């Protein structure tokens, strides 16, 4: 099974406090596993999985050592960006970064990521090649020239090709405590009518993992895409996801109306 590891960073300024809010948040495959928040009483990285509780102190502070560094880096960078855009001091800013890696079925790397986004918009980001950057807007070029100079990308690449991989592998190997499991969909149709011509059919799907699912209504085999109420794949609060899809129907036709269901963790598409 393919895997990923993600760090979701976010600094945030609001006025009247010269000291922003920093928050890192880790994720293995689609599941959180660590977390830091500068605005805590004791700002320290924490386990968020059960399998993570299995680390012991040197790890727990090798990371909090880093978080305090990045905290300083974000404070600094947020101010720099202020200048590149001519924003005066006085409002709410946001800087986010996302970094991680991906590995195929065969445990090997497939892709690295390192990308930033200022104010919600892409700012600068690292290429599939790990050697060169893509700057999004003019101001983003300052940083680019600046960073080509200081060889910042090698470091990144190193973290991505090495310490990311080597470390994920071991997350995987303590990881079965949820990671390598595939919770299959649990699908059934609702109803709820009234009105002539109305019946409103509802194909649900529940308890699956990962969130990738495609429910499809069909008349014989021609995909009933018309007024298909599709809901956004939502989380259950447990490690699984939900979803449904409605289609409107002339009451009493329900026979040859049929939503198929699709998922990695299934034997074959669930016809309903």
């Amino acid at each position: 099974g393919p895997h990923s590891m993600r760090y979701f960073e976010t600094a945030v300024s609001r006025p009247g406090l010269e000291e922003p809010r920093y928050i890192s948040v880790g994720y293995v495959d689609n599941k959180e596993f660590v977390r830091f928040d500068s605005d805590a009483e004791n700002p320290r990285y924490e386990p968020r999985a059960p399998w993570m509780e299995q680390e012991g102190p040197e790890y727990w502070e090798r990371e909090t050592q880093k978080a305090k560094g990045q905290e300083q880096w974000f404070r600094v960078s947020l101010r720099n960006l202020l200048g590149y855009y001519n924003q005066s001091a006085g409002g709410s800013h946001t800087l986010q970064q996302m970094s991680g890696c991906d590995l195929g079925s065969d445990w090997r790397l497939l892709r690295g990521y390192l990308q930033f986004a200022y104010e919600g918009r892409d700012y600068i980001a690292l290429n599939e090649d790990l050697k060169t950057w893509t700057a999004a807007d003019m101001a983003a070029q300052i940083t680019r020239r600046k960073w080509e100079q200081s060889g910042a990308a090698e470091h990144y690449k190193a973290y991505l090709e090495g310490e990311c991989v080597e470390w994920l592998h071991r997350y995987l190997k303590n990881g079965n405590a949820t990671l390598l499991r595939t919770d299959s969909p649990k699908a059934h149709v609702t109803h709820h009518p009234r009105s002539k011509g109305e019946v409103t059919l509802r194909c649900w799907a529940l308890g699956f993992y990962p969130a990738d699912i495609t429910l499809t209504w069909q008349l014989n085999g021609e995909e009933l895409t018309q007024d298909m109420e599709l809901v956004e794949t939502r989380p259950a609060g447990d490690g699984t996801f939900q979803k449904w899809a409605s289609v409107v129907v002339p009451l009493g036709k329900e026979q040859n109306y049929t939503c198929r269901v699709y998922h990695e963790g299934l034997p074959e598409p669930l016809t309903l």
Binding site: E63, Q70, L81, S99, T143, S150
Partner: peptide, 9 residues
């Protein structure tokens, strides 16, 4: 394991 940023923006 976290990454650590070098050069600022």
């Amino acid at each position: 394991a976290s990454n650590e940023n070098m050069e600022t923006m």
